[model samples]
Target: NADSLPERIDLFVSLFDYNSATTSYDIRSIQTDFPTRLLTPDSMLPQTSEYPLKDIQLLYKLAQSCTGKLPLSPLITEPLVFTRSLCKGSSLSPRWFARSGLIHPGGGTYAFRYAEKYPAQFANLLPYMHIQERPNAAEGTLLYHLQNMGEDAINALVSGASMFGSGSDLWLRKGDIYYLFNEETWLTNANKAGLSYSLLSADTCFIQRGNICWDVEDH
Candidate 1:
């Protein structure tokens, strides 16, 4: 159900201006092929880091897990629970978990904690992400979470089902989880050089911290 999550994420990013000082958008419904309840945005991933994992090292660890290296265990090691944080302004805050919901705690509530001065893309992502599009999306963290490993998750993602993994496919196993990375923010050889994102062009630079950034540092 959440199968098209990555594509949907980039699609939303493409429509919004990441560098706008008063960056905000109408959180609109994005119709997906999946059923309403199965892939609701509020569903929680089994594991989460208060902030996203370091991209390079996260890739390294995934490979190691695939190769059956040491520390044979699930990719996510954190226990899901209610934990308060230095949240400011609700959705954009750094709170790790919801204080109220226990059964299906929301994911990425702490996303903007990563929105520090480090990278501009993170600040760009949550503007829309924090705003759930669908009504059934129900205060769901507005991001997709691979919540269950039942017939649904399996049937949706599998190609030709292998009863077991190929030793290089930890991502193939259930319970391995991750957050969607903003591809719009990264430079890849696949993207057309002439059509690269304006944020990538050296001619355009903006200082991004969290909810706000500036194209001109102007009022």
Candidate 2:
């Protein structure tokens, strides 16, 4: 079933410029598409595992597309083509522009944000951060937990919710395995606030620690 298909995927963002004399700041258009052959198990790329072949191919494609230096073009569209001016602003007092491109240096990746006029079209893109709500926990900001998902879970999140972040704690099943994904950051942040913190081994998941409780008071 399409609903039960493999979760991992690769995405390419295609953009277009939009200008309307009646509107201020103009607009930008973004579209996402995946390469055709990566769609099904029988047609997937070789040298990759079953469940995550698409995600693996995504990383491979990104690595192949990046360059050591920024090209003269404003954005990287395909494998070798670079273009001029991804987002060009107007000459009015408040100029509006659109920009697009890839990444460099420490991590060869890229991301962008645009005006409300340029609402994003891509349904699934892995996010750097996410929020999981825990009504069973604390009140106010403390009630929400900042978290991330494994590649599988991340893909599930995209397909299930059509969102990169959540306001409900449903991602963590009561009896299912979970892990402390950002242990170091949690420890460091706690220490700066004069609180003592301990973590399950960096190599272990929460299931290994047998820490099933999510207590707000202790945290």
Candidate 3:
């Protein structure tokens, strides 16, 4: 292992610099008290009163239809400057990176196009790309995915899974309503992916995440 390579995520990296003699890249001290709060599609809005979240029962489709965005610190001012550092060691186009917001973009055509255009570069950048995996429309990804970026993080999910059982064995079948979550268990979950689109669309109360509750025709 003489040749330096991009470190695999499985290998733990240090969070702080506290070395006296024997321990250089050590990870003993953890800072869990760092501030965190759930954010919406836009920047942080302190007033949950500005947009009160209704009962979780009513917001299922609205949540899953939207994916999480990798968030940043208020301390972060020059975003493009940070983007340049992430883009280093890889030939990912600055323009595309700008447009995609360093997101995986999606699992479809956009992802394929970039991957095909530059395999090695994309592969190197793959670890940094934030995939769409969150399902909480009101409380977005700052807490979930972004916290877990290839850095030191202590994460917790406050979903139904935290309280009740998911009953995964019951919905493991392909055409079943919750198939995908069973298959892609890593990122996909009960309220996010592995849901039945056609079945939900039939319901009179539900509408897609981005659609307005009153004006949406699909609902």
Candidate 4:
């Protein structure tokens, strides 16, 4: 390992003091207290009493069509606010570190792009790249495949399988559908090198989190 060369993500590592430790907690524990509100695509109206959720049954029907029922308990304990430091290594935006090409720009082309072009570089960046043994969509690496509910994650699912009997199974189905977007739909639309399209056109939906009611056809 000592003889091996470092890569792009290494750029981030290069800057990191390595003296600090980081941890990844499951969403359930992280978001135990986040509120779960069912909303529709057209419902980003900013929770105002002026327009209380209209048509409850229609909302439920809409939710059923997109995926089963996906009840996401917000990762509350880890408030999006509290985890700022973890999100960005520094109090300031870490983007500059990579964007400036100071860490491990290898040959320019943007260090992140280097990771995208070279799998080796990617591995260098994410040492645990293949730890899960399942498909996944990394943010910058390019969305090529649908990451599965990994074996370890699946094992957890089985352990909590009862909490989901029929009720939980809905979440499982929702999970499948939720993933379809990232895996299938998103992959199909990715460019040759797995890039998101620049000028894309799709029936855009702004329905807030759980609300999925409107279905509009372009034609």
Q: Judged by lDDT, which candidate is best?
A: 1
List all candidate RMSDs to the true structure.
Answer: 22.0, 19.5, 21.2, 23.8
Better of 1 and 2 by TM-score: 2
Ranking by TM-score: 3, 2, 1, 4
Among residues 3 or more apart in sequence or in different chains, the pairs in candidate 1 whose N, CA or C atoms overlap within 3 Å are 42-140
Model 2 misplaced stretches (Cα beyond 4 Å): 1-98, 101-108, 111-147, 161-169, 172-219
Selected candidate, larger TM-score, 3 vs 4: 3
Kindly list the per-residue Cα lDDT of model 3 for residues 1-219, writing each as its tens digit: 423222321121121112211111111111131112221122222222322233221222223343233224332223323333344534445455445433221222222334555675554444333232222223222233233322111121221111111222111211211111222332233224222222122213344465433234443
Among all windows of 10 consecutive residues in model 1, the one with the lowest summed lDDT is 165-174
Model 1 CA deviation exceeding 4 Å by range? 1-29, 32-41, 44-72, 77-106, 109-111, 116-122, 132-219
**True-vs-predicted CA distance for residue 105, candidate 4, Å:** 17
TM-score of 1: 0.18
> Sort by lDDT, best first: what order?
1, 3, 4, 2
lDDT (Cα, tens digit) per residue for candidate 2, span 29-82 = 101222111111222123233224443344345445542333222222331221
lDDT score, candidate 3: 0.27
What is the lDDT for 130 in model 1?
Answer: 31
